[PDB]
């Protein structure tokens, strides 16, 4: 019962860019937006999420811990105190704990990127929400509907359980 | 007309790790292995691929250009002259050409990775073939069969057309 389409950046035969398709998915949200992302500095996509939250959509954002300050820096430059928006919850996720050969205890990264809307549609792939993925890199995503979406919902709830309030907050 | 299973690292409720599943896909190859990868330094996966090529399997490897010398250094340290293996072709892919803030010319990265075997099975996701994805990071892949595999074959041929002989050769 699963359907999958592919999109590329730079775009191939398809009408819309990956970024235009992200904006469409957020505009079409009725209930819930769930986002897992490694680096998030794109102001246009951020503005779309904030607008969704003002019309009553619940928004849950999970960001890689080591890159969180880039998101916080962007929201501040835009004049937005995001921690005051009650309809948006932002939390951070760490990778595995490991020890370096000088004995220090480090953690790695959450290497995971997907957008899950109304428990009904997913965008999954290698595109991160930053300028370099518009101007510099080659990337691809899947647009997913049907039974497989339930597996992405289960993984989002598992990462949300692991996630923490950001230390800056 | 497409079936998809999810695997995680660290593993969840599945018997094999992602790396064990990669080795199994390569051992089961009968005709062709097509790999797209951003960084490749895992000696164990490299040895499985070489073994497949001695079996008569045709192997095509596409690597991100900026990271290529990490792969070359690993093969040399293992005492392998990968140039000499006629059944393996290794080529590099560049991202988009762009101009930086200061006007310097750079190219971006190929942010893509997937393993395509015998034109009938794909592993697609965020796992790279390096130590950090075993011990430090969280990642996920899909095992894909059915009609969508043709779309990955088409994209591999398009990337192969774009790709170049590595400058380091």
UniProtKB/Swiss-Prot annotation, chains A, B:
It is found in: Cytoplasm; Membrane. Signal peptide: none annotated. Phosphorylated in vitro by CSNK1A1. It comes from the Eukaryota. All members of the FAM83 family of proteins share a conserved N-terminal DUF1669 (domain of unknown function 1669) domain of about 300 amino acids. This domain mediates the interaction with casein kinase 1 (CK1) isoforms. Therefore, it has been proposed to rename DUF1669 the polypeptide anchor of CK1 domain. Interacts with EGFR; positively regulates EGFR inducing its autophosphorylation in absence of stimulation by EGF. Interacts with RAF1; displaces 14-3-3 proteins from RAF1 and activates RAF1 within the RAS/MAPK signaling cascade. Interacts with AKT1, PIK3CA and PIK3R1; activates the PI3K/AKT signaling cascade. Directly interacts (via DUF1669) with casein kinase isoforms CSNK1A1, CSNK1A1L, CSNK1D and CSNK1E. Probable proto-oncogene that functions in the epidermal growth factor receptor/EGFR signaling pathway. Activates both the EGFR itself and downstream RAS/MAPK and PI3K/AKT/TOR signaling cascades. Belongs to the FAM83 family. This is Protein FAM83B. The gene is FAM83B.
């Amino acid at each position: 019962g699963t359907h999958i389409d592919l999109l590329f950046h730079p775009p191939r035969a398809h009408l819309l860019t990956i970024k235009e398709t992200i904006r469409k998915m957020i505009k079409e949200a009725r209930k819930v937006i769930a986002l897992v992302m490694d680096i998030f500095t794109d102001v246009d996509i951020f503005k779309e999420i904030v607008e969704a939250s003002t019309r009553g959509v619940s928004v849950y954002i999970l960001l890689d811990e080591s890159n969180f300050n880039h998101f916080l820096n962007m929201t501040e430059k835009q004049g937005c105190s995001v921690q005051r928006l009650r309809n948006i919850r932002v939390r951070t996720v760490k990778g595995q704990d490991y020890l370096s050969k000088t004995g220090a205890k480090f953690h790695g990264k959450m290497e995971q990127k997907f957008l899950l809307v109304d428990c009904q549609k997913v965008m999954y792939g290698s595109y991160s929400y930053m300028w370099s993925f518009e101007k510099a890199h080659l990337s691809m995503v899947q647009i997913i509907t049907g039974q497989l979406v339930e597996s992405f919902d289960e993984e989002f709830r598992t990462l949300y359980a692991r996630s923490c309030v950001p230390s800056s907050f």
